[PDB]
């Protein structure tokens, strides 16, 4: 390489329409356009982009008729509003909109045939589940792969022991 270099140196089908086409102009009041184009004219070529397109389209402005804005649009496009935010302080002592307070209100208003230690255990388990959900909220999107277990039977002994122990984990528990 270097040594030799030095030595020498010294609706219709989408597939029938083609690829999706997009165009956006900052200057247009016209909204950005995206659509598939299939019109075939030999007059509009890369060699002569500006050639007339007879019987194809009018060389007339459509952005102005598309959007003659002339309105208080607040210029939502950029540079304003995204960064603005406001904080506040609240009261949550009268009607508690919370897991512990909600559970307490539910248990006080509605009483069932459940032991108080059982109610405490259930509340703790529900709070733990909510906390685990909040922690797993950071997982966000997780692509999930399908799982399928075939017809494995006790008669067969050459089947995969992994699936065997997996289904053993799903045992049927009888009661006396």
């Amino acid at each position: 390489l270097c040594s030799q270099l030095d030595q020498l140196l010294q609706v219709p089908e989408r597939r029938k329409f083609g690829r999706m086409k997009l165009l956006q102009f900052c200057e247009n009041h016209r909204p950005a356009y995206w659509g598939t184009w299939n019109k075939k004219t030999a007059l509009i070529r890369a060699r002569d982009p500006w050639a007339q397109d007879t019987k194809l389209l009018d060389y007339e402005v459509d952005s102005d008729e598309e959007w003659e804005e002339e309105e208080p649009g607040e210029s939502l496009s950029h540079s304003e509003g995204d960064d603005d935010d406001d904080m506040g302080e609240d009261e949550d002592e009268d009607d508690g909109f919370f897991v512990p307070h909600g559970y307490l209100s539910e248990d006080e208003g509605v009483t069932e045939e459940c032991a108080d230690p059982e109610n405490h255990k259930v509340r703790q388990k529900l709070k733990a589940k909510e906390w685990d959900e909040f922690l797993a909220k950071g997982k966000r999107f997780r692509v999930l792969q399908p799982v399928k277990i075939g017809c494995v039977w006790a008669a067969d002994r050459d089947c995969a022991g992994d699936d065997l122990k997996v289904l053993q984990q799903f045992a049927a528990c009888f009661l006396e």
Binding site: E65, F97, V99, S105
Partner: protein, 109 residues
């Protein structure tokens, strides 16, 4: 070298899909966005007040309230691109309240 120049200051409505050939797999729409983008407390106070308006001696859950939330903005976005398609068909880009009402009737609310 090169001559330079001074810069100038710079200033049909139900789109139901046919029973076949529809294998759309939008996964984002499955999972909750976890992006409230609403101030929780004006929402909460408003809900509390209208609830008192309807009935009294009642309690809520934060889960129920947040559920109310995503229901809100989900309906918002639904109506919202409905209004977008209307205004595009309405040959206009600035959104009018009549557009909201027309989309609302497109659903049939």
């Amino acid at each position: 070298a090169r001559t330079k120049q001074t810069a100038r200051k710079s200033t049909k409505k139900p789109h139901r899909y046919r029973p076949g050939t529809v294998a759309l797999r939008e996964i984002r729409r499955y999972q909750k966005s976890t992006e409230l983008l609403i101030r929780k407390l004006p929402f909460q106070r408003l809900v509390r007040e209208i609830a008192q308006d309807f009935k009294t001696d009642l309690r809520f859950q934060s889960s129920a309230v947040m559920a109310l939330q995503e229901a809100c903005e989900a309906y918002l976005v639904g109506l919202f691109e409905d209004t977008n398609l209307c205004a595009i068909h309405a040959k206009r880009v600035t959104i009018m309240p009549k557009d909201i009402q027309l989309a609302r009737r497109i659903r049939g609310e």
